């Protein structure tokens, strides 16, 4: 960095470093404060969040609570579990967002017992609706959307995640105006469009058009679809049946594993440089003042 820049001792000395997880630009503490702190007269009642994050093409849903030692996963689902349920391609799209939320809701709601009561909407017509509490009986499991750093846009797929955890039985408080098919100039949802997205209707109709206007591109992206003979129109049943498969058995299978922890550990240290000792450092200095000093 430029000479006239470059930090003075005093700059560095007084520098107050942010929280690590801010330096990492990973955590909005302002939102977290407000996501996590509980009503003080509700004592040790955990305040569970529904964490939805998007990697370059994996979807992560964890149900999380907080502890001063660290946060706590109740459950976790990933859209890369969806091949197990009959979804192979496009697992980062709106409907993979939906699926996973559904997967996450069903899974936890199971291991909590609220499984057979609170099924949530089994139909799915993209009707706007929260899961209502069963008269005489346990209140539903309540959970708050942790969007993270995601911008709120009307159509964002983080809210796709939200739709399916709510469709799946969770009580996740929310309004309707960030779902595709929310009309800008009228406080009005078109659920016909929102049904469409849940079942990847936009992806499908995008294939149908690329079919007969430009097959150059249609085979680049959408390659996989060709390769498995899934020409569009079936995309709904694909996801319609995922929903089925998921509710039928959400109970989370781990990867088999192959090679042990000890073993993954063994090979990883092969690639991990090791710090030097003081002695070792001393003999590099000494070494240097024989060369750079002793007139070569």
């Amino acid at each position: 960095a430029f000479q006239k820049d470059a930090k003075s001792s005093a700059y560095s000395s007084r520098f107050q470093t942010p929280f690590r997880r801010r330096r990492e630009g990973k955590t909005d503490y302002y939102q977290r404060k407000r996501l996590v702190t509980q009503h003080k007269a509700k004592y040790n009642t955990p305040k569970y969040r529904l964490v939805v994050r998007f990697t370059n093409k994996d979807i992560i849903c964890q149900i999380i609570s907080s502890t001063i030692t660290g946060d706590v996963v109740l459950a976790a689902a990933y859209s890369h579990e969806l091949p197990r349920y009959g979804i192979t391609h496009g697992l980062t799209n709106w409907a993979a967002a939906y699926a996973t939320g559904l997967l996450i809701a069903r899974r936890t709601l199971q291991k909590l017992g609220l499984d057979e009561t609170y099924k949530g909407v089994e139909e799915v017509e993209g009707e706007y609706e929260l899961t209502e509490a069963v008269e005489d009986g346990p209140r539903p499991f309540k959970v708050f959307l942790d969007i993270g750093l995601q911008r709120t846009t009307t159509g964002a797929r983080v809210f796709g995640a939200l739709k399916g955890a709510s469709d799946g039985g969770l009580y996740v408080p929310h309004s309707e105006n960030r779902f595709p098919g929310w009309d800008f100039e009228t406080e009005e949802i078109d659920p016909e469009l929102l049904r469409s997205y849940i079942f990847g209707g936009h992806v499908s109709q995008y294939m149908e058009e690329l079919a007969d206007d430009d097959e150059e591109r249609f085979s680049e992206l959408f390659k996989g679809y060709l390769a498995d003979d899934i020409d569009a129109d079936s995309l709904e049943d694909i996801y319609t049946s995922a929903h089925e498969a998921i509710r039928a058995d959400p109970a989370f299978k781990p990867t088999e594993k192959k090679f042990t922890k000890e073993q993954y550990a063994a090979e990883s240290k092969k690639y991990r440089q090791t710090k030097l000792s003081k002695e070792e450092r001393a003999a590099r200095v000494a070494a240097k003042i024989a060369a750079l000093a002793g007139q070569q």
Partner: protein, 169 residues
């Protein structure tokens, strides 16, 4: 090394500093509009100067930022006017370059007495791939040294493709 630490153009920002609002500015605008295909953005004066005859918040200038192929169709076009000779300044320490021209007529575009004649400031900013790191929301970070755009890197880049001259010392 060298795989995809290539040297794209980040964006081209054309700028007209018309120290006044009113008609003359809305003509300076029209130029950039038809020239960029995009609708230009106006800029208010930052404070009053009075010997420049401007007031705070007046609207004093128009400018427009252009990316991708469209930015080259124009760069080239201006570079022509400059007869493919810039100067050893012009290029900034952090790897950008700019030049100016007067009379935009010298890059296609007829005369039209009802629009007049304007000069332009061309400013080309360079970067490589992976520049997103700086610009994105999450895990915003800074490009590593040996991936930063530098003067040498940009001048040599310029000297090659375009096959234009640098000049001076």
């Amino acid at each position: 090394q060298n795989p995809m630490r290539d040297l794209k153009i980040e964006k081209l920002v054309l700028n007209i500093s018309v120290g006044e609002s009113g008609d003359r500015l809305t003509r300076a605008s029209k130029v950039l509009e038809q020239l960029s295909g995009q609708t230009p953005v106006q800029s208010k004066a930052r404070y009053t100067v009075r010997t420049f005859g401007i007031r705070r918040n007046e609207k004093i200038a128009v400018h427009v930022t252009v990316r991708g192929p469209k930015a080259e169709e124009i760069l080239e076009r201006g570079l022509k006017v400059k007869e493919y000779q810039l100067r050893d300044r012009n290029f900034s320490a952090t790897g950008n370059f700019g030049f100016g021209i007067d009379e935009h007529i010298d890059l296609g575009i007829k005369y039209d007495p009802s629009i007049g004649i304007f000069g332009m400031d061309f400013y080309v900013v360079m970067n490589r791939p992976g520049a997103r790191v700086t610009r994105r929301k999450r895990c915003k970070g800074t490009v590593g040294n040996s991936h930063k755009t530098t003067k040498e890197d940009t001048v040599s880049w310029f000297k090659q493709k375009y096959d234009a001259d640098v000049l001076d010392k």
